[PDB]
Amino acid sequence: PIFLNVLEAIEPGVVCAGHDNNQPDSFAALLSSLNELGERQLVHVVKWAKALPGFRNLHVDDQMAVIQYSWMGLMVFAMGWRSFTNVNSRMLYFAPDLVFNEYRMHKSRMYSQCVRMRHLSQEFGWLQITPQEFLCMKALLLFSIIPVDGLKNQKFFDELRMNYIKELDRIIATSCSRRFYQLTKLLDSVQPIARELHQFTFDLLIKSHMVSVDFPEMMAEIISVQVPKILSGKVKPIYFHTQ
């Protein structure tokens, strides 16, 4: 009840990209629309995270830090879920007005990364992931990437992460063992994908002026101030299993 009640209650609603589906697809248009969508989803991720059980237990600087580091993974995971429930993983459901078919995957020059995301979407089906498991996993995803040097108050974070793992346990509760194994394996699989996208969005920002791709305010800041911490190895994801 309680824990799951909250997660269901705070789950972000539908978010549109504002893409003009009347114009023929193009690299600059598609990626710019994705960037706008990302900015819009970031606002929802912030509202969502600040409302999570026990989030205020974290030092304020850590609250902002984990959101910024986990942003990509959170979006990827939710998108995969949306693609699974809406189009049964046939296409990438970024938004109602921004659905990626093979042609767009190609036109966006993000084909390889889209293939990875589509595979993740397919796993929700192959694993018969329930909406309740999805909710708990996504919440745990927010607490799955931290600085190797530690956070301002690592202890409050460790405590919070531990409790979310316990909640996943309960939702699951030799079948419990196997379920926990595949769900943690699934969660781990998000990280390599998020890294690929981190590299891609970083390179895109650096050359955005040359390819006519627009980056919203917060995104440009986060991608140039925080993401490089991840790409340079200062900030790393927390894996359940050894990669």
């Binding site: 970031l42 606002v43 912030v46 509202k47 600040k50 609250q63 902002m64 959101i67 910024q68 986060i222």
Partner: peptide, 10 residues
């Protein structure tokens, strides 16, 4: 500080 501003506005 674009993110912190958002963070503090919601």
């Amino acid at each position: 500080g674009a993110f912190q501003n958002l963070f503090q506005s919601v």
